[PDB]
Structure formats: structure tokens, C-alpha cells
Amino acid sequence: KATGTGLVYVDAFTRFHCLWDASHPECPARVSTVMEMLETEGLLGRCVQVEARAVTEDELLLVHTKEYVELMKSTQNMTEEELKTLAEKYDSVYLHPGFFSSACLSVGSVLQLVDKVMTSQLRNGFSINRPPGHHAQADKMNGFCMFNNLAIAARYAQKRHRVQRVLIVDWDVHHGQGIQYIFEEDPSVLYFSVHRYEDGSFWPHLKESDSSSVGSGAGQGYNINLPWNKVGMESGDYITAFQQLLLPVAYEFQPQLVLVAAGFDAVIGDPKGGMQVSPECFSILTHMLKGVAQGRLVLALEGGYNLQSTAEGVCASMRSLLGDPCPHLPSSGAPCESALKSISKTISDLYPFWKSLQTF
């Protein structure tokens, strides 16, 4: 049997930042603070250190267009004004001369963990990477992302490791619309995102972030959006969503690999997410996901902007990956009415496609 929890972190993840705002939320301190807490908590030393690698062109082209890859590669040589001009053509993006290099190692870090997990060298793993990936699209940056780390990893697992079915779970407080678009017509990848939505008033402000977007073509039924329409959701809301919606579908889908867009902007204290999820909740969510795919689970960091809250969320997830007993949840409680309304609506939209959801 596979044993061990992999961790990838390289100093290159700190070597890019916003050139026009020294206080930009997507900053090197996000990942260095995580690493400092993993060490203080004694968790870092229990992990198997896994080297990062740079993604190749062929791997990027599993998801991205050649023209976009070439444009991103060219940012290495642009001036600060050239970088600002290009970044402002995208939605919520900054650029930096080291962004491309770091983005290539960010992708490659996930591919390394996929290698170790799919060949049973490790049970599971976590990349402590930036830049994030889940908003990046075939031919554009978006939302602090250049390359779609997990979408590339999913297609890489299929091509290199002969995986038939991949589940991608996006618990970052934002909708990973890039992942949705990439796998829209693909029944071999099931994408589930829970995200703040507020009827479109919360970024990215897309109608396709609602639960009516279920996939298309052969992929119909394999895209599952759970939008929250009120702020302040707690652990009981996320636990209910996983138990009543995600896990029934996951056990029916029978994935061979689970990839997690592991953002921590839904954690208590995040300045953007507006949710009240205890970090300890992520130990429970991680635990639930270990039950499918024979525990083959790879997490990659997405968002999360309160340095302490994000570090605590990573630590809680890591404790589960390492096999530590699940925590007692402090502010635990039944789901609220608004969460039940959203869960019910998504179930009603996905009901025709999944027999496990037909409990009424």
C-alpha cells in the first residue's frame, strides 16, 4: 500500500509580486506564512519533501493554446509598463518578470505529486504553490492566475498515468470558471465548485457560476456548481454540502484521482471571502475525500488572503492527509436555511444525471 504525504514548496514561489501595490493581497507572504506554520506545528517534518519541476510546453498545451503560452513566455522580457499594459487587458491580474517562471513551477509541482500518488510512492500530497490556477483559461489570464494548475494535472494524469476518471473539488470561495470551461464537454472529469455567488454580485459575476451550468455534450451532468447567496456560511454548511451533494456523486462517479483546488478564502477572517468556516472544517472535508479514489488525493493552493487563516486551513488539511484523528469542530451546528436552499437547488439541477441524488 502507498504511504506518506508529499509536500512541494520552492523559494521561486516567493519571487514575484505586484509592482504597483506593495499591499496587494496575492503576495509572497501567503506561501511563506503557510510554510512557517507547518514547521511550527511539527507538520512539515512529517511530510515527504517532493521536488518541484518546471512544466513543459507539451504539458501546458494539454489545456492552453500555443499562442497564449508564447505570449506568457514573452512576459519574462517585458518592461514594467509593458507588463502593466498586458495585465490590464485581463480581469483582476497583475504581472511581473518572474511570474512566468513561478507559474511553470506552480504547475509542475502538482504534476510531481500526481506522479508520486498515481504510482503508489505516496498516499497523497499538497503543493504549497503560487500563482494559483483555477481561473486561468485556454487563452487568457484571469483572477491572479496564468496557467490552470489542476486542469493540466487532470489531463496529465489521464495521458501519463492512464487515469480514466478525475474528480476536481474546488472549495476556494470563488468559482473556478477556468476549470469549468476546460472540462465543460468532458465526462472523464467531474468538476465540483462551492463558491460565494450572491446572485452574480460576487466576483467573477458570471451567470455560468450558477447551478444551472451542468456541462454540455458528453459532459452533461459532470459540472456541479453550488453557489452561496448569503455570507457567513459555517462548517455545518460545507459539511452538509459535501455529505448531501458532492460525496454521493463522487461515490457514483468512482474517480481514480481527486484533485482539490484548495483555496482558504472561505476560512474565518479572510478579508475577501466573507465566510465563517473554521480552519478545522477542512480536516473533515479532506477526510471525506480520502474515501474515494483509494485515497489518491492531491491538494494545490489556490486563494486565501488572511495569512494566519490560510496557514491554519492548510495545517488542518495536512493533519488529515497525514492520518491524524479528525478534530472536534468548535462552532459546529446544523446548516442554515440559505445553505439548504442552495444545496436543494443544485440537487434539483443535477437530479436527472445521478441516481444517488434521487432520495425524494
Ligand X SMILES: CC(/C=C/C(=O)NO)=C\[C@@H](C)C(=O)c1ccc(N(C)C)cc1
Annotated active-site residue 287? The verdict is no
Phi first, then psi, for residue 193 (nearest 5°) are -125, 135
Most distant CA atoms of the chain, gap in Å: 60
Residues 6 or more apart in contact with residue 141 via CB below 8 angstroms: 72, 87, 90, 93, 95
- Residue 183 engages Na ion in binding (rule: CB under 5 A): yes
3-state secondary structure at position 163:
coil
Contact of 46 with 38, CB cutoff 8 Å = no
- Residue 172 engages ligand X in binding (rule: CB under 6 A): yes
Query: Exactly one of 135, 175, 195, 287 is catalytic; which is it?
Result: 135
Cα distances (Å, whole numbers) of residue 251 to 69, 125, 164, 356: 36, 21, 15, 9
In the complex, the smallest distance separating the C-beta of residue 305 from Zn ion, rounded to whole angstroms, is: 8
Instruction: Fill in the per-residue mask, 300 to 339: x = in contact with Zn ion (CB under 5 A), - = not in contact.
Output: ---x------------------------------------
In the complex, the smallest distance separating the C-beta of residue 328 from Cl ion, rounded to whole angstroms, is: 9
In the complex, the smallest distance separating the C-beta of residue 337 from Na ion, rounded to whole angstroms, is: 21
- Nearest of 293, 262, 321, 352 to residue 165 by alpha carbon: 293
Q: Minimal CB distance to ligand X: which residue?
A: 303
Strand 223-228's sheet: what is its strand order? 48-49, 5-8, 124-127, 297-301, 257-262, 166-170, 189-196, 223-228
Q: Within 10 Å of residue 1's Cβ, how many Cβ atoms?
A: 6
Instruction: Residue 303: name its binding partner from Zn ion, Na ion, Cl ion, none (Cβ under 5 to 8 Å by kind).
Output: Zn ion
In the complex, the smallest distance separating the C-beta of residue 174 from ligand X, rounded to whole angstroms, is: 4
Known binding residue 210? Answer is: no
From the list 6-14, 59-67, 129-137, 206-214, the region that binds ligand X by CB under 6 A is 129-137
Q: Minimal CB distance to Zn ion: which residue?
A: 303
The binder of ligand X chosen from 99, 144, 197, 282 (CB under 6 A): 144
Instruction: Residue 31: name its binding partner from Zn ion, ligand X, Cl ion, none (Cβ under 5 to 8 Å by kind).
Output: none
Contact of 271 with 231, CB cutoff 8 Å = no
Known binding residue 265? Answer is: yes
Residues making up the annotated binding site for Zn(2+) are 172, 174, 265
